[PDB]
Amino acid sequence: VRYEASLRQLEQRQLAKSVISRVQSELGNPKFQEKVLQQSISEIEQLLSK
Amino acid sequence: NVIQDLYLRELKDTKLAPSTLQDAEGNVKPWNPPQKPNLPELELQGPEALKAYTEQNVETAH
Amino acid sequence: EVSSILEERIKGVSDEANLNETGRVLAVGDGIARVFGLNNIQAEELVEFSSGVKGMALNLEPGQVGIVLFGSDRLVKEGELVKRTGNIVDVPVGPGLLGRVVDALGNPIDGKGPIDAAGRSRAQVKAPGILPRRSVHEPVQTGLKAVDALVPIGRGQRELIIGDRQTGKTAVALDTILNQKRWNNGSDESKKLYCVYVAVGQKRSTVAQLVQTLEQHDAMKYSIIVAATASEAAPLQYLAPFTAASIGEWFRDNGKHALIVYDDLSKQAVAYRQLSLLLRRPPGREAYPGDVFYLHSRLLERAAKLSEKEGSGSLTALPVIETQGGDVSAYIPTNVISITDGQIFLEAELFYKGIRPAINVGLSVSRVGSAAQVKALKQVAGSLKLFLAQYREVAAFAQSDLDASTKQTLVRGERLTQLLKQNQYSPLATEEQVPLIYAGVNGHLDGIELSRIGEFESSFLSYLKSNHNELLTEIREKGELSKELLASLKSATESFVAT
Amino acid sequence: AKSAANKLDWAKVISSLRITGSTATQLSSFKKRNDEARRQLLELQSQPTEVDFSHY
Numbered sequence: 001v002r003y004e005a006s007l008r009q010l011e012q013r014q015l016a017k018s019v020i021s022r023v024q025s026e027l028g029n030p031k032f033q034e035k036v037l038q039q040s041i042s043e044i045e046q047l048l049s050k
Numbered sequence: 051n052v053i054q055d056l057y058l059r060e061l062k063d064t065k066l067a068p069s070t071l072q073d074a075e076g077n078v079k080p081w082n083p084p085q086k087p088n089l090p091e092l093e094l095q096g097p098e099a100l101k102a103y104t105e106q107n108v109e110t111a112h
Numbered sequence: 113e114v115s116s117i118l119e120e121r122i123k124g125v126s127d128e129a130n131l132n133e134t135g136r137v138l139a140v141g142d143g144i145a146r147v148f149g150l151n152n153i154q155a156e157e158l159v160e161f162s163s164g165v166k167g168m169a170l171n172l173e174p175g176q177v178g179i180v181l182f183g184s185d186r187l188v189k190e191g192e193l194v195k196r197t198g199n200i201v202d203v204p205v206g207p208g209l210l211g212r213v214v215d216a217l218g219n220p221i222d223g224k225g226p227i228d229a230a231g232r233s234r235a236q237v238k239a240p241g242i243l244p245r246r247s248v249h250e251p252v253q254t255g256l257k258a259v260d261a262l263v264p265i266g267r268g269q270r271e272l273i274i275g276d277r278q279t280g281k282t283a284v285a286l287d288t289i290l291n292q293k294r295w296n297n298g299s300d301e302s303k304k305l306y307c308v309y310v311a312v313g314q315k316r317s318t319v320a321q322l323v324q325t326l327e328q329h330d331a332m333k334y335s336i337i338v339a340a341t342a343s344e345a346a347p348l349q350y351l352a353p354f355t356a357a358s359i360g361e362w363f364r365d366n367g368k369h370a371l372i373v374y375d376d377l378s379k380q381a382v383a384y385r386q387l388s389l390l391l392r393r394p395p396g397r398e399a400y401p402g403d404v405f406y407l408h409s410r411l412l413e414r415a416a417k418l419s420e421k422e423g424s425g426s427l428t429a430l431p432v433i434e435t436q437g438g439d440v441s442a443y444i445p446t447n448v449i450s451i452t453d454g455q456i457f458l459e460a461e462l463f464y465k466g467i468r469p470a471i472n473v474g475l476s477v478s479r480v481g482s483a484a485q486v487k488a489l490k491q492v493a494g495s496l497k498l499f500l501a502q503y504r505e506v507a508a509f510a511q512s513d514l515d516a517s518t519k520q521t522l523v524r525g526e527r528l529t530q531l532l533k534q535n536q537y538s539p540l541a542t543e544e545q546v547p548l549i550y551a552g553v554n555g556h557l558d559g560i561e562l563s564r565i566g567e568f569e570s571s572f573l574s575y576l577k578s579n580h581n582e583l584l585t586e587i588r589e590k591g592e593l594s595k596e597l598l599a600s601l602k603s604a605t606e607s608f609v610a611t
Numbered sequence: 612a613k614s615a616a617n618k619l620d621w622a623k624v625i626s627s628l629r630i631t632g633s634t635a636t637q638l639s640s641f642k643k644r645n646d647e648a649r650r651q652l653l654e655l656q657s658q659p660t661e662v663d664f665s666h667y
Contacts, residue, residue: 015066019057039052054123110632
């Protein structure tokens with residue numbers, strides 16, 4: 001049971017470094033550009049809703 | 051949003067394959083099952099005992 | 113699996129900054145960020161940094177508002193957006209904190225998940241008024257034999273536990289929690305004290321042992337441990353008793369009774385000192401900030417026995433003060449002593465001399481005292497106070513030709529002193545306290561050998577359990593001793609004493 | 612029962628009072644008292660004999 005809990009913790013840190021890799025993937029692609037456009041229009045709609 | 055997308059992508063596209071039972075076995079206590087509390091031998095056999103008790107006992111008051 | 117829990121949380125992020133007041137750090141030093149912005153801000157409001165640090169805003173100054181960071185310095189840096197939570201410090205309160213070891217913020221450090229809290233209430237709530245209180249008449253029994261008789265403790269009361277540094281100060285406190293299990297188990301909510309232990313500055317290892325001890329005695333199911341550990345930040349430490357009090361208020365407000373043990377306010381003082389000096393507020397006596405009195409008094413007057421208008425409810429309190437080399441003239445002790453309605457004064461010699469509890473009942477006083485004492489126990493222990501008083505005077509007679517009267521006293525006193533010992537982490541019921549004391553009072557134990565006092569107690573108890581558990585039950589239910597009961601009790605005592 | 616064992620044991624102490632030379636009264640008493648006390652604390656100590664495969 002102790003190792004089961006440990007394995008869950010190990011799983012969490014393993015899954016953490018995969019996020020770091022995915023972060024590098026998002027910032028590399030022109031998803032980096034396209035999501036800035038998405039944020040821009042999203043902010044336009046939101047800020048208009050103020 | 052894009053945050054959700056990033057996560058979705060990460061989780062979906064990056065899958066772990068869990069560790070073997072053997073690796074777990076090392077990291078846990080293995081188990082050796084204790085067998086038999088032993089059967090002792092019959093104590094104070096023979097008429098050595100019978101004679102010993104009858105003869106030895108006589109120590110009573112006056 | 114764990115990933116699935118993460119997806120839900122990530123889906124739960126979709127908040128957006130919709131706030132017309134922000135701040136940007138101007139300079140960050142000493143955990144005292146000095147922020148430019150926050151033009152309209154409520155005092156002591158909780159503020160959230162870019163680095164997710166939480167803070168309160170102790171100084172609102174004309175040009176800058178000096179937030180004090182609840183987080184670590186490394187996280188914060190210049191210019192950081194300072195979102196305004198817009199809520200003065202409030203922490204979830206409800207019945208959910210029962211059997212929950214929580215940090216100050218309200219997050220479970222025992223990981224028993226989100227608190228079942230029916231409100232989040234502000235940390236500063238002014239003390240109950242003159243008319244919202246009524247006179248105390250409900251005992252609380254610590255199970256420690258000396259305490260219950262010599263220093264009887266009621267409910268909704270202030271009563272110090274001023275004593276020597278970590279000489280099981282915490283042990284004396286924990287014992288009360290254990291004895292309350294017996295009454296707590298009892299269905300009536302007049303018999304249910306929902307205890308709160310406020311662990312201030314106590315290292316996580318120490319609090320882990322506490323947690324373990326409580327769990328062993330299954331006290332978690334009415335216990336709450338508000339934990340501000342040694343590592344926890346000085347703002348959290350400052351607000352830790354204030355926060356804790358609010359948790360208590362929910363029970364009290366609901367009309368129930370509860371007991372909050374602030375341990376130790378001496379360490380609370382130091383944390384406030386750290387804040388004040390760093391906020392450049394003028395220093396004061398014993399290098400403690402000047403309004404430390406105002407804080408301590410404010411905290412301690414949120415404990416009271418509320419009127420029947422207020423549904424009889426109460427919040428008993430027992431502050432613990434740690435004596436810095438026995439200096440009771442020290443500024444922080446003197447202040448607390450004034451505020452408290454009684455003090456219990458543990459003496460080092462007694463501890464060393466193996467007397468545990470090491471409470472010196474010479475300088476222990478309760479200013480409410482016998483008003484909320486069990487009637488039975490009151491009857492059989494007025495005498496006990498007087499005998500012990502004489503024993504103190506006749507202490508010096510310990511070293512040739514000496515009056516018989518003094519020697520009789522000396523014997524009676526020593527046997528009594530041995531009798532009032534209670535091994536640490538074992539409480540006792542009042543219905544078994546009174547018989548033991550009756551014997552001693554009647555001087556039966558004077559005859560009994562000192563070594564055989566220990567044996568006597570359990571044996572007498574066993575004799576009572578078999579022979580006269582009618583008496584024990586009568587004592588328990590009647591709650592008073594009557595001449596007929598005392599008659600039977602005397603007989604029982606004689607019979608046991610003879611054997 | 613066990614109450615007999617000890618009753619007869621202590622009866623023999625007050626019998627040995629009347630017939631001194633006891634040197635094995637103590638050996639009889641010690642052995643029965645000991646092992647009787649050992650089995651009762653064993654039986655109260657006893658772990659559940661199954662592996663908890665319900666929860667764990």
